[PDB]
């Protein structure tokens, strides 16, 4: 459902990751920050016909 965009005369996508991670981050430890939930994010042409 990702919209398409014309670059160089060819259609290409635009979807782009958005890594994420605990919020407990807020308590001790450091670069120990590891990831824990990748959300993919995109764009549609939403309609509500009826």
């Amino acid at each position: 459902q990702g919209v398409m965009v014309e670059q160089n005369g060819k259609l290409e996508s635009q979807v782009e990751m958005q890594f994420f991670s605990t919020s407990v981050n807020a308590m001790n430890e450091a670069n120990a920050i590891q990831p824990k939930l990748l959300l993919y994010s995109e764009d549609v042409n939403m309609e509500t016909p009826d």
Binding site: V24, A26, M27, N28
Partner: protein, 377 residues
Amino acid sequence: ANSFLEEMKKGHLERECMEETCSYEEAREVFEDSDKTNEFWNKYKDGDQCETSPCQNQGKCKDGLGEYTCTCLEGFEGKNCELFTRKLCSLDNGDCDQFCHEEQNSVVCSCARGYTLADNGKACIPTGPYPCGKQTNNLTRIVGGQECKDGECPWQALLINEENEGFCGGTILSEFYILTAAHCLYQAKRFKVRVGDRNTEQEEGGEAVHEVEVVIKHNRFTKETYDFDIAVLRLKTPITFRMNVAPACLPERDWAESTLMTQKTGIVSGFGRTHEKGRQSTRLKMLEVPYVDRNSCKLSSSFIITQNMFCAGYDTKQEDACQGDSGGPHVTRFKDTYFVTGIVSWGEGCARKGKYGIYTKVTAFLKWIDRSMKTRG
């Protein structure tokens, strides 16, 4: 703990976090911040650390997961703020501004000429209206030199020959006696002193000329090996201390060897030659260079280097003083005040790779200098 519906509402610090495992999260939504959650949580794995009152003398207690952190009052160290920290000359100059002492497991501050100690026990008193040690792409041979700002170099003393051409730089000691190099006197049997010189040709009216009265020079000086090059000359008219004429603080023999010259940097000034085979300099000049170690000092020079010689400058950066700068002011900016360190005599050329400018140790001559005033003062 973290059951269903349960956490479909809001936590309560009695309901959950006590009778339950109280992992965290639910321990953190009650405040929603950082101020209380950490400290509060730290006391449920093994207890609170400020129960025991570990720190001493009102040292702030900070809890933690298995440790207590103390933040004591002024001057307290140690694990439980039980250690009463000793102030030493190495440990923050004994809090003294200029002169420190290590008297009987403590510090009792003194001061130099024109300086006394206030009731605070650490800071001095600049009795003198203008205390010593305070600041009261061009081509054509500017060797990193800086023109002194107005009053920035007030101890600058100059020695002028008969033909109205001042040669040797110097540090203004007082109104009556002026230090100089012993061999700066070898230039003539007669010469005078003019102080405050900044530009010989353009006059602002702010120069003072004082005749040289009696020669007080070094006895064991060597005219070849440049051993013990120092001298003292007297001024006929007293120097009224003003913005362009201010004295330079005299350190003590031990103190300048323990703290003053153990600092990294110093300042070199004079009116000598800018470069080898070069011309004289009229605008008042100063330079910025650091002090380097002795273990590279011996390998630099071709003379015999003894305990009275030290090395200052750069091996790489080519900004070095030259002939005619002998006796010039070589001061170091201490914590808040200048104190003289070196006196120029010679140099194996000027600005040579791997070489240093030679300055005689002032503190190795300060007991010599102080002897000069109580014999014929």
